[PDB]
């Protein structure tokens, strides 16, 4: 019973509960929510544990319920631990939008996903293919062997590589840097020594791509091997500006928070319910169509280059 013509309500109380307060990435993320909330003339609130807090997310959700927020935007640390309190909120007609990390499907109205695993894996292979000039060896520098996210992205990369059009690209090795600066550095060195014909190292970890770039930048492989992957714009800027890295991907965290506010407002205003195929407007981000199980995908990964790297600060 979505009414696309229902007006977005003013004065909505929209609260954000990230995984951890007070880090640059998270600040940019919820800061985007603050902008969107101001646009729709709502009231913005930020709560959450800090670095040396041992408080559960449940304690914060319960607080937001008692404060009678209209929308709770939350990055769930555990998909199920938050369910009882989130569903208590929804029983009180509070709309619940997860972001970054999702809760069990039955404990929120919508999930803002910054990029799908398909999107990420496609982008990694697409960038690798361009940098390799259409053919040649590539290697992955990953996080830990059991890393859930990287393992998903790598599986998508493999499915992509198995397509007829990517037949000339060969994945020769996956190395693990364990999201550790020094190990990632040494593993990058190891890849280049072991595979003299290597064209691209793809590192789908912010730690890993920075460490590989730092190695390549100060080695004899500068200009001779490409480095791409998933990186943080501020950490990667010096390597983009010095020519070591031409292209890499991630997403704009501010848009995640911004999109979450509009989705939450659309839910609370009756424009959408979270059913697949429903459409709504999200300000500067344009029109969105809700996907399966209430997932709303921000878009394909954002590509960073010298042409646009100063446009972002995180």
Automatic annotation (TrEMBL):
A GO BP entry: rhamnose transmembrane transport
Sample GO molecular function, one term: carbohydrate binding
Keyword Phosphoprotein (UniProt): no
Disulfide cross-links: 83-107
UniProt superkingdom: Bacteria
Ranges where the Periplasmic binding protein domain occurs: 14-271
Chief site of localization: other
Annotated GO CC locations: outer membrane-bounded periplasmic space
Subcellular location: Cell envelope
Coiled coil regions, renumbered to chain: none
The protein's name in its UniProt record: Rhamnose ABC transporter, periplasmic rhamnose-binding protein
Organism for this UniProt entry: Kribbella flavida (strain DSM 17836 / JCM 10339 / NBRC 14399)
């Amino acid at each position: 019973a979505a009414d696309p013509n229902a007006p977005l309500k003013e004065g909505l109380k929209i609260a954000y509960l990230p995984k951890q307060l007070n880090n640059p990435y998270t600040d940019v993320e919820v800061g985007g929510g603050k902008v969107a909330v101001g646009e729709i003339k709502g009231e913005y609130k930020l709560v959450g544990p800090n670095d040396a807090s041992a408080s559960s997310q449940v304690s914060y959700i319960n607080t937001l319920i008692q404060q009678q927020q209209d929308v709770i935007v939350v990055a769930a640390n555990d998909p199920n631990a938050v369910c009882p309190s989130l569903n208590q909120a929804r029983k009180a007609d509070i709309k619940v939008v997860t972001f970054d990390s999702d809760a069990a499907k039955t404990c929120r109205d919508a999930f803002i996903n910054q990029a799908t695993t398909q999107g990420i894996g496609e982008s990694l292979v697409k960038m690798a293919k361009e940098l390799a000039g259409g053919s040649g060896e590539i290697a992955v520098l990953s996080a830990t062997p059991n890393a859930t996210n990287q393992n998903s992205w790598i599986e998508v990369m493999k499915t992509e590589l198995a397509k007829p059009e990517n037949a000339k690209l060969k994945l020769v090795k996956i190395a693990y840097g364990n999201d550790d600066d020094q190990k990632s550095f040494t593993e990058a060195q190891g890849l280049l020594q072991s595979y003299p014909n290597l064209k691209v190292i793809v590192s789908p970890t912010t730690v890993g791509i920075a460490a590989a770039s730092r190695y390549v930048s100060a080695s004899s492989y500068k200009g001779k091997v490409a480095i791409t992957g998933l990186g943080l714009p501020n950490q990667m800027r010096q390597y983009v500006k010095d020519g070591t890295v031409k292209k890499f991907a991630l997403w704009n965290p501010a848009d995640i928070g911004y999109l979450a506010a509009y989705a939450g407002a659309a839910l609370k205003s009756g424009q959408i319910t979270g059913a697949q195929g429903e459409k709504f407007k999200a300000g500067k981000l344009g029109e969105y169509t809700v996907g399966a199980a209430g997932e709303i995908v921000l878009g394909p990964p954002t590509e960073f280059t010298a042409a646009n790297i100063d446009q972002f600060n995180f």
